[PDB]
RNA sequence: CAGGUAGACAGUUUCUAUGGGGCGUAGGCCUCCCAAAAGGUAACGGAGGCGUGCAAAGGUUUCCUCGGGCCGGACGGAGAU
């Protein structure tokens, strides 16, 4: 449905709105990294496992084990400790997962405005964020530590920014 | 025979480097400069280190390759994923 809608409404409008040419070379999502950072500073392995076994449900894919980059900060943080995870889906697993947030999960969240600020990175890429009060068909508020949010960075093959929101707007993403 | 005490007595040591000696400091090895474009080459002449660490930071095969900054994102208000 999400993937099918792409080549039957999404791409079409992307051919008339922008420069007229072939079929491809149009804004197309390549991956969706819904990273979910964990409360740093506090040295606890519980929060780490509570994260890896958290996103592995909504995406059904084993998270990552990023390591603190070697640097000299103010805190007493060392290099070699895991403090975050970022899963990215591709192909069908991407369009399918992306269709979820669009259809379900939202506006399931109580009091969901939808008005997004400026944002944008500067190269056909868009990213969003969810507060510590979200909801997903996979998430179970029955056996979890504490309500925590996560980040969702969706990158596309768009060249410019004006070709980023034009792909998510006609797609179904709240705007 | 043997354990203490035993310079009262006897035999000696108690360094050198150092533009006096002495005090201090300096008296191997490893990096740069003074050595004036092959090396070698002085002076307590100018700035820093070592007397180890490591079943592996050993070898090999494959693969992966930064720092920092800008524009964005829940927990960001200078840096953290």
* Residue pointed to by tokens 């596309």: A156
Q: Give nearest nucleotide to A66 (CA–C1').
A: B81
Nucleotide nearest to A77 (CA to C1'): B80
Q: How many domains does chain A have?
A: 1
Q: Which helix (H) or strand (E) holds A102?
A: helix A92-103
Q: Which two tokens stand for residue A84?
A: 């975050």
CB A10 within 8 A of CB A24: no
Alpha carbons A85 and A56: distance in angstroms, whole number: 10
Beta bridge partners of A128: A152
Is there a contact between A94 and A31 (Cβ–Cβ < 8 Å)?
yes
For residues A7 and A24, the answer to whether their CB atoms sit within 8 Å is: no
Q: Does the nearest atom of strand B lie within 7 Å of A150's Cβ?
A: yes
Q: How far apart are CA A68 and CA A84, in angstroms?
A: 9
CATH label of the domain that carries residue A103: 3.30.1440.10
Please report, for residues A32, A65, A140, the alpha-carbon distance to residue A173 in angstroms, rounded to integers and kept in the order given. 13, 29, 24
- Residue A62's domain comprises 1-175
Count of other CB atoms within 10 angstroms of residue A3:
14
Encoded tokens for A59: 């995406």
Which is it for strands A29-33 and A125-130: parallel, antiparallel or unpaired?
unpaired
Q: Is the CB of A119 under 7 A from strand B?
A: yes
Q: What distance separates the 2 farthest-apart alpha carbons in chain A?
A: 56
**A151, closest nucleotide (Cα–C1'):** B73
Provide the experimental method for this PDB entry. Answer: cryo-EM
Contact A150, A35 (CB under 8 A): yes
CB contact burial A39-61 (16+ within 10 A = b; e otherwise): eeeeeeeebbeebbebbeebbee
The CA–C1' separation of A83 and B17, in angstroms, is 61
**Can you tell me the distance from the alpha carbon of A31 to that of A43, in angstroms, rounded to the nearest whole number?**
31
Q: A125, A119, A50, A45: which is closest to A82 by C-alpha? A: A45
**Is the distance between the Cβ of A83 and the closest atom of strand B smaller than 7 Å?**
yes
Among A159, A120, A125, A121, residue whose Cα is nearest residue A26: A159
- Locate the DSSP E strands across chain A: 29-33, 88-89, 125-130, 150-156
Cis status of the peptide bond prior to A160, with omega within 30 of 0: no
Give the nucleotide with minimal C1' distance to the Cα of A39: B75
Nucleotides of B under 7 A from a protein CB: 67-68, 70-75, 78-81
């Amino acid at each position: 449905r999400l993937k099918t809608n792409y080549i039957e409404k999404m791409v079409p409008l992307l051919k008339e709105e922008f420069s007229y040419s072939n079929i491809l070379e149009v804004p197309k999502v390549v991956k969706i990294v819904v990273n979910c950072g964990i409360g740093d500073a506090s040295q606890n392995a519980k929060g780490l496992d509570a994260a890896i076994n958290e996103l592995a449900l909504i995406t059904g894919q084993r998270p990552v084990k990023t390591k603190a980059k070697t640097s000299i900060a103010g805190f007493k943080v060392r290099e070699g400790m895991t403090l975050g995870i970022a899963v990215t889906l591709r192909g069908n697993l991407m369009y399918s997962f992306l269709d979820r947030l669009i259809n379900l999960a939202l506006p399931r969240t109580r009091d969901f405005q939808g008005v997004n600020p400026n944002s944008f990175d500067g190269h056909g890429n868009y990213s969003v964020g969810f507060r510590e009060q979200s909801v997903f068909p996979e998430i179970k508020p029955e056996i979890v530590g504490k309500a925590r949010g996560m980040d969702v960075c969706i990158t596309t093959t768009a060249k410019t920014d004006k070709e980023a929101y034009k792909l998510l707007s006609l797609m179904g993403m709240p705007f």
